Amino acid sequence: SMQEEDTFRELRIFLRNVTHRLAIDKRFRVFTKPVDPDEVPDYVTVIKQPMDLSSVISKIDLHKYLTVKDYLRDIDLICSNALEYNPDRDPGDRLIRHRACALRDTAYAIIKEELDEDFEQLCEEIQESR
Numbered sequence: 001s002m003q004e005e006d007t008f009r010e011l012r013i014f015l016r017n018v019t020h021r022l023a024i025d026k027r028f029r030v031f032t033k034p035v036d037p038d039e040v041p042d043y044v045t046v047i048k049q050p051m052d053l054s055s056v057i058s059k060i061d062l063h064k065y066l067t068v069k070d071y072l073r074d075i076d077l078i079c080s081n082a083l084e085y086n087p088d089r090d091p092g093d094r095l096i097r098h099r100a101c102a103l104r105d106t107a108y109a110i111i112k113e114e115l116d117e118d119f120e121q122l123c124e125e126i127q128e129s130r
């Protein structure tokens with residue numbers, strides 16, 4: 001449907017906006033880009049599904065998200081990856097975990113306030129019909 005395509009274009013606009021706001025926050029800089037192999041060669045070993053905000057943007061533009069739920073699974077992934085890979089009591093680990101939780105909480109709070117529930121329901125219904 002043209003009406004369905006207008007729905008998804010609006011979804012993408014919404015997601016790019018939320019993602020930009022996360023990406024510009026200083027606390028979240030470490031999540032803006034993939035991890036550099038040279039600097040962290042064991043990351044790829046421990047972390048089987050790397051995710052970051054740059055990859056999120058690419059996926060939005062490739063039309064990979066048909067719902068906000070699907071987007072939020074990638075945000076959750078950014079966070080869970082960080083908790084898994086940096087699990088120690090050390091302060092560098094604690095800082096990154098704190099920041100990962102803040103990224104997740106912030107994405108959820110923005111969505112809670114700004115996503116129309118009927119809009120999401122529509123996306124989910126279109127997705128479920130394909």
Ligand SMILES: Cc1cn([C@H]2C[C@H](O)[C@@H](CO)O2)c(=O)[nH]c1=O
Binds near residue numbers: 031034085086
């Ligand atoms: C995303 C992430 C980055 N980093 C560090 C390693 C890299 O050298 C740098 C940039 O990714 O930040 C971690 O230690 N753990 C992580 O989970």
